[PDB]
A = this chain, B = another copy of it.
Amino acid sequence: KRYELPPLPYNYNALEPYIIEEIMKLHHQKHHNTYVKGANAALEKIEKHLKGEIQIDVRAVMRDFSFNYAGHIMHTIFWPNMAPPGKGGGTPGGRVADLIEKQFGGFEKFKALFSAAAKTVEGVGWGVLAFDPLTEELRILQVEKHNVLMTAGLVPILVIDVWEHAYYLQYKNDRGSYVENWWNVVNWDDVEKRLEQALNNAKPLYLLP
């Protein structure tokens, strides 16, 4: 089954002033679309290989699949993780706030740690807040590229893209300012919904019921 580019949940200019329209348009129509196409291209090669029509370098094509699939799913989460300022921004409540209190000692400490993780990604990558199916707790990590340092199990519920293309046109080299500004468009309702699903569904995938 082939991957498809999802529409954004909002207008290309909907995250302004925090992320400009030009970035949103390039990011979605070029970058994300390229990962969708790359993932499908890798699958097509695997198909031709399985049908015996070609012989592929299995390692190489799977590396291509890994990178592009990861790019696709990460951007798929990234867009609805944001919302126009109002619906987006502010401080979380509910289950997310509760786990943030338990795991990190409150929102301010969480924000400082998450921001540090995002700002200090070496090269391009992501800051990731994930739900751990083994402990049913939150974990923060970095991902390099789309597919380096990511682990099995951990379910991303909030991600920030710190690839240079995510901010350079507006913030230039100042990734720090981008990260600080990104908090203003975080869709906590989306994160809350993701956590609800993870609490219900994640653990049984690994520790059988």
Contact = CB atoms under 8 A, between A and B. Distances in A.
A24 interface: no
Interface string A29-66: 01100000000000000100111000001111011111
B149 A66 contact: yes
A122 B145 CA distance: 8
A7 interface: no
Interface string A75-119: 011000000000000000000000000001100010001001100
A65 B141 contact: yes
A147 interface: yes
B65 A139 contact: yes
Nearest to A58: B116
7 contacts: A3-B134, A60-B63, A62-B149, A66-B151, A147-B149, A164-B168, A168-B169
